[PDB]
């Protein structure tokens, strides 16, 4: 059915349909798919499913120009920890991959993989049945009661990674997006939000190391400018974007409650620009925004209303892709676009209507999402959210 | 004469008029005169002006309820450097200054001493003959080629501080403090911007240092957060404020082409409500806007338009002063003032119109600024701009 309380507005006398360069993509409008974990990938070997990964890309592939960024996938086995989400390390994957990126192209759009590492995201106890490791910044607080619980039954320590470990990820991310360009990507996206690997180094409460990787915010930072500085160099840094959650608080990350959050996110922000003036400006940034600081809460649950991103507008001068809660408030993107660098990801509504980009055009309404087959091994919740057309042949407006 | 092209308009409907609290003072309005050195001091013993400066403070302090922010005061000889600007060390000087506190009093208004170190920005010949040393937080670039000049002739190099040093300086910051509150004052604020030296610890520019003091954010604060705690243990948070101009270029800051200042500056922003939370929160910061990163420029000139100060407001959560270029800008000043906690500080015309809340109140024409008198040993420029009424009696508004 559609999203009964809402009002539609038409955005298509907004920039965010006017067309705009993303690295070597000519972007037709700026409504972009954020990366959307979906866990339909196949076990054993974390592989794209093989009978709907491809119908589900195209499908919201199908507005000609739309950048696309994937569900993450994993870097590596040590990086990993969920059964049913992608890997790009494999070749029984990037044969997956591969038609997937076809099709993307096929359709006209373009396709950005996110590289992941859970870090203390991960189950212990697939990592342990694996004889893998259960990695994070540091070893003195764990993520939550459900993780320590997991943790005890699986006899897998929360283990604060050595140095030469953190040059082993840092050689798999390269690796990652080598395979990643290779089999036909149009870029990466270094995840660094979100609580996961990057993200516990970057934040206080999760890096209580004291050696270079921590203690300051130069070294909080490190882990992730190393990652940057890798692949820019590997694949050019018109291929690379890097995605922050500065005020996230998903995963057990600090948020605005950490007085020092906005000087860690500047910093960072800061010497993206000095690479930026160096000759190595990054294809974009990608902020998830205040308005929702945990993903799985509902539309409007879970704003910080206490903190902005703006700043990063101060210091980075590159494109800027702003995700959270922005399908139902098409009042807040009206505004946000009136900036010339700024695209909106538009993340659950993506899931829920493959056409989104049309809808957002002209007003339409939208297909509310079901939360239930966010993460189901299913094609229903994935591939059968119809269209407008379709939606409108069973009904939907009447229901 | 009254300035020519400007259309006044009333703010008396805005909370530009409505009382706040700042540390132990019930202002009864948000125009806050900025510190304004103006030089009338007199050499030797640095003295406040003992024929006028009582008199310009009095007339500034004429509406009920305004905070006062003094000219920028030397807390020692060392700190000094300028002939005529005075300082806050000797019985001399304080006997002159607890007159002007309790002139600006008796008018029901309030006096917080700005607190200055000049560090580069000081004449190297002046110290020179006072045998003092010519300071700054490092040996390898100097302020401009007009101070290198005044250095060589003065066979007076400029000088890293060493350790010991910066602890005398914030010894001689504890009793300034002291020294301003046992003569009457309300509060101090401790100045932190304008390319001074806690200035140009703070800057990257300026500080090349690669001991504690240097090589880092944390550490590029250090100086100026040392200088903060002090003085809260020495007289009270509530009567401490802080000044910044994380855009300023005057005195050879670097403004917003050094990509990590925003960085900086919310570092300092967020230690500041660090201690905040730990119940010493300073009773307010007052930045100096990217409207003005220059204030010998004439309004409209030395405009950052790459900036914005808004980052502090995500971070610090006590009162804010902003100051610059606001006076010939209400509509600007309506829009800012909408924020609860925001006062607005109007330098160059408080200089030149002694009533300047009336006129901002009411929407009256102002009257134009001497530039040429605001740095002359001279009662003229300084305690002869008329009033709205007198302007009139004058004719003003027939010029
Ligand atoms: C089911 C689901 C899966 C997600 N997977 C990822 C992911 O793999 N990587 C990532 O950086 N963010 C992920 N996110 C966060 C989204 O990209 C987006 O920032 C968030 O959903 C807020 O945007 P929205 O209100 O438009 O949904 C996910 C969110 C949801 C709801
Ligand atoms: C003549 C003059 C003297 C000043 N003296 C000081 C000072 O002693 N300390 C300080 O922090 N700022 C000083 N400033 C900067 C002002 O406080 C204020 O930030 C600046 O003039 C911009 O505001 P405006 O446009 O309202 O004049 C001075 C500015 C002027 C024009
Ligand atoms: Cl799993
Ligand atoms: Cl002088
Ligand atoms: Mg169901
Ligand atoms: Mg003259």
Chains 1, 2 share one sequence.
Do not use: C
Not at 12 to 35: C, M, Q, S, Y
Not at 97 to 109: L, M, R, V, Y
Not at 226 to 249: C, F, Q, T, W
């Amino acid at each position: 059915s559609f999203v009964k309380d809402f009002k539609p507005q038409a955005l298509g006398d907004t920039n965010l349909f006017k067309p705009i360069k993303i690295g070597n993509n000519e972007l037709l409008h700026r409504a972009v798919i954020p990366p959307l974990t979906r866990m339909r990938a196949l076990h054993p070997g974390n592989i794209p499913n093989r009978d709907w990964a491809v119908e589900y890309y195209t499908q919201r592939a199908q507005r000609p120009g739309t950048m696309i960024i994937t569900e993450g996938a994993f870097i590596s086995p040590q990086a990993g920890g969920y059964d049913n989400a992608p890997g790009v390390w494999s070749e029984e994957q990037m044969v997956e991959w591969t038609k997937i990126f076809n099709a993307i192209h096929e359709k006209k759009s373009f396709v950005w993989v996110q590289l992941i590492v859970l870090g203390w995201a991960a189950f212990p106890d697939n990592l342990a049945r694996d004889g893998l490791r259960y990695d994070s910044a540091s070893d003195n607080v764990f993520m939550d009661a459900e993780q320590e619980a997991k943790a005890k039954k699986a006899n897998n320590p929360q283990h604060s990674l050595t140095k030469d470990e953190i040059k082993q990820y840092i050689k798999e991310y390269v690796q990652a997006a080598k395979n990643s360009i290779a089999a036909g990507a149009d870029g990466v996206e270094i995840h660094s939000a979100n609580g996961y690997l990057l993200n516990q180094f970057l934040d206080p409460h999760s890096n209580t190391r004291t050696d270079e990787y921590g203690g300051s915010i130069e070294n909080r930072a490190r882990f992730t400018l190393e990652v940057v500085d890798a692949l820019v160099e590997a694949i050019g840094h018109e291929k690379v974007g890097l995605r922050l959650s500065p005020y996230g608080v998903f995963n057990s990350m600090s948020g605005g409650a950490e007085t020092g959050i906005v000087a860690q996110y500047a910093y960072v922000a800061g010497e993206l620009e000095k690479r930026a003036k160096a000759g190595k400006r990054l294809a974009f940034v990608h902020l998830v925004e205040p308005r929702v600081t945990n993903p799985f809460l509902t539309e409007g649950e879970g704003e910080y209303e206490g903190g902005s991103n703006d700043f990063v507008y101060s210091i980075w001068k590159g494109p800027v892709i702003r995700a959270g809660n922005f399908a139902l408030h098409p009042e807040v993107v009206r505004e946000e676009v009136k900036d010339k660098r700024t695209l909106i990801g538009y993340g659950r509504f993506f899931i829920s209507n493959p056409d989104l980009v049309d809808r957002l055009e002209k007003g339409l309404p939208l297909n509310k999402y079901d939360r239930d087959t966010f993460y189901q091994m299913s094609a229903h919740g994935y591939i059968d959210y119809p269209t407008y057309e379709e939606a409108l042949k069973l009904g939907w407006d009447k229901k």
